[PDB]
UniProtKB/Swiss-Prot annotation, chains B, I:
Residues 1-37 are annotated as: Disordered. The gene is J. GO terms for cellular component: host cell cytoplasm; viral capsid. It comes from Enterobacteria phage phiX174. Interacts with F protein. InterPro entries: Microvir_J-like (IPR006815). The keyword DNA-binding applies. This is DNA-binding protein J. GO terms for molecular function: DNA binding. The keyword Nucleotide-binding does not apply. Pfam families: Microvir_J.
């Protein structure tokens, strides 16, 4: 048969380890690692989750070189909790005048079709988002967020985010 | 049999049908009480 | 047929004598057309015929 | 490079062209042809063959 | 590889929080929040569900500016119940001469392919619906409905609805 | 992004409630409601299932106006049992000289890709079927069937069937 | 919306019942029923599985009328076990000089994307396979195989296999 | 209906049995069998997993005949554990100057959309990867990796990897 | 060898085959008992 050659994520080619050992969910959701560029993969073999209500997230900054209002942003994730902390996952967009460490009080949420199974979650999707600052002198951040009424547990997995501002080339034997 | 044995193929493209009737007009057929457009 | 028997003697029969329809005209032709080429990933190299005469 | 004795190299192996074509039911080439033949014989007609007298 | 650039939902870019803390399912299913426009995203971090038979729903109004009989309506949802209230989810169409607070006795239902997993539900789909009033002087509402023999429990998640009356533009680097 | 505009079911626009309160599975599988036309949606908020071996089904009649041997038939379903009655679901084709109330002894079965999860089942698929009577003076019925070694339990959901003999039009803003 | 009209299985139109009541898994995996032709659907309402290590399978013979090396073979299945016999499912290709009753010691396996859920399994896929005898004077058989460390249990469902050597026609109202 | 004829994996046509009976997960993740060529299928009917933190993997070598930087690599897998060792699965790229027996300290990870269900995992996907050595005089290996906080358990299944450097031909009856 | 060594390529398009037989007619071949159309 033929090969598909069309996808929805297109990861980064370089992955980074999480420099942290614990997180505390809160309404001001903490950022796991410092945001960077327009593409980033984060994997963690062991993360301790403390009891708390709220969430936590992994985000990237938006590139504003191209003057186009609406752009596509992709995600691919795979998380495994030891317990079953009934939770929902979404895509969050927010703005900040400096480098953020938590989530501000003004933000938007978006639905993405994942594969909840109880402790397990997988997704590979794309969503169109308005990427321009919408308010002068601000940066825009887009992240992958997990929210629940958390208890003490543990998790492992990886998260990857990508902003479609350029196209990736690949080898096609017939073309 | 009798008298035909002709042929009918033509070249070109099958243009859409234009007008249901009309090859040669005779007398009037319809009377409504005036003109109607 | 009866009209065939009379014809062999050299005679003729009208269609009223035989009670048969009268053929007024007959036409015949061959039907032609062309092909359409497929252009996507799976149908590149496939053709479909269209007869119109 | 072809293998075997001399006779195996000189003759054509049609498996050497398998990767050049797509898989179809009509092998590697196909043709549609009309043959217009005409022979001048010395034979009786069909009428002479079926009539005793 | 190439990017897909074709989707099934196309959310709104602006999300709203639920101004409510509890709901009571009933045969006259209550509406969670006031319907609006032709597109709306609703997220709720905490909702209390009381015991009752029936359901509840989130809906939008239909725009009648364009005189086209049949139109496409999309949904994207993600719900998490604490217990397992065996339930089914569908798309419901109804009509009302004023702003509704419950579901009337005449309505239609439609099936959509979700991802039930026990307490969890996810969907991202589109359905063609006749959007004209079908009876003079009435408004048409389309919603996302959850129905079960409910007990006392809790839920969290978000729901997004969209009516395809215009097309969304996005950046394509090759085009 | 663009909108998909291609689907697999295309429901009916009018849904009907089940006039019944119980069913008894058997080898002669009972029909839930009287078959009709070439398209029908049936929803039931409460159905009691009695103990028995066999199944039950919801079907439609086949339209024979168009003289085409093979046609496509679609299904969209969503069922929720209270217990876990290990069961399999399929598409069944049979013939009858009068209006049927059970399943005859001669029939065919077809596989469709559903989403079993334990008490839960969802599907949205299409299958090509030969629709002509195959024996003079008979009607053809196609249904959605559930088969198991049932015990006493309860279920809720909806089932929708469609025969693709005409095409549905929809609004496309760019076309 | 439009109708899909593209699928992955294309079942047979005629289904056959299993003439058997029990099976014993083994390393020489037994064949459920006599292989036939290039297309076959098998359904069984009740099958008893005895304790044993290995598997069992349902297969078809390969048609060699067309001289094409590689061809596509499809499968659609739906199985329900009473217990949870942790098992994996695959596609198996083997060869035999006579009609087989078990699986020989030389064979190949292929992966297909199913939907394991615990006692439940569903699949609808296609795989390219080399169908010519690969050794003179032999027949080629392709089957659907289930393998585990089985205990005493029960199962129900249906399995359908198809070899794509011809194309199926269907009614399209617009074409 | 029509046949799809487009896929995402395209397995090898020849499968190999695992010559091993146990594995011990570690941070230096062991390789199950000796890497080979650009395509390989491995199936194992019985594998014993000892207690340990880390993972294990099955990999192939990359072919460097064609001077193209980025190429597509496919995977198809199906694993069944007896217990539920909460784990995540990914694609790993690494480099070595000799034939490897473990995973070095420098590597990259990639997300792929699988179907975790608890003891069960299935996937069929493709990812673009840079395949050139990135450092002179080295070989590149790409594998399928499973990582968890493992205990003593057992597993069965098969794993298949493929590098898209050539295209596969198949029979199409209409073309 | 003997006598041919000719060539046969022509330009144009491969028109579909039209009529199974017929380049030059001789005598009648079939007798059914009358005319048949």
């Amino acid at each position: 048969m033929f090969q598909t050659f069309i996808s929805r994520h297109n990861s980064n080619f370089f992955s980074d380890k999480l420099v942290a050992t614990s997180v505390t969910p809160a309404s001001l959701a903490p950022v796991l690692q410092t945001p960077k560029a327009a593409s980033s993969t984060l994997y963690f073999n062991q993360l301790t989750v403390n009891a708390g209500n709220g969430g936590f997230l992994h985000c990237i900054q938006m590139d504003t070189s191209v003057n186009a209002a609406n752009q596509v942003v992709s995600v691919g994730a795979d998380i495994a909790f030891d317990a079953d902390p009934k939770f929902f996952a979404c895509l969050v967009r927010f703005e900040s005048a400096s480098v953020p460490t938590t989530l501000p009080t003004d933000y938007d949420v978006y639905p993405l079709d994942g594969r909840h199974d109880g402790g397990y979650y997988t997704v590979k999707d794309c969503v169109t988002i308005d990427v321009l600052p919408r308010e002068p002198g601000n940066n825009v951040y887009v992240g992958f967020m997990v929210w629940s009424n958390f208890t003490a547990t543990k998790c492992r997995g990886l998260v990857s985010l990508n902003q479609v501002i350029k196209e990736i080339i690949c080898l096609q034997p017939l073309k | 049999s009798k008298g035909k044995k002709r042929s009918g193929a033509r070249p070109g493209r099958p243009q859409p049908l234009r007008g249901t009737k009309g090859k040669r007009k005779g007398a009037r057929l319809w009377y409504v009480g005036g003109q109607q457009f | 047929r009866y009209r065939d028997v009379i014809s062999s003697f050299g005679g003729k029969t009208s269609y009223d004598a035989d009670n048969r329809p009268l053929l007024v005209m007959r036409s015949n032709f061959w039907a032609s057309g062309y092909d359409v080429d497929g252009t996507d990933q799976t149908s590149l190299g496939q053709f479909s015929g269209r007869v119109q005469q | 490079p072809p293998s075997g004795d001399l006779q195996e190299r000189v003759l054509i192996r049609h498996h050497d062209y398998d990767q050049c074509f797509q898989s179809v039911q009509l092998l590697q080439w196909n043709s549609q042809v009309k043959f217009n033949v005409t022979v001048y014989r010395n034979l009786p007609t069909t009428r002479d063959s079926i009539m005793t007298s």
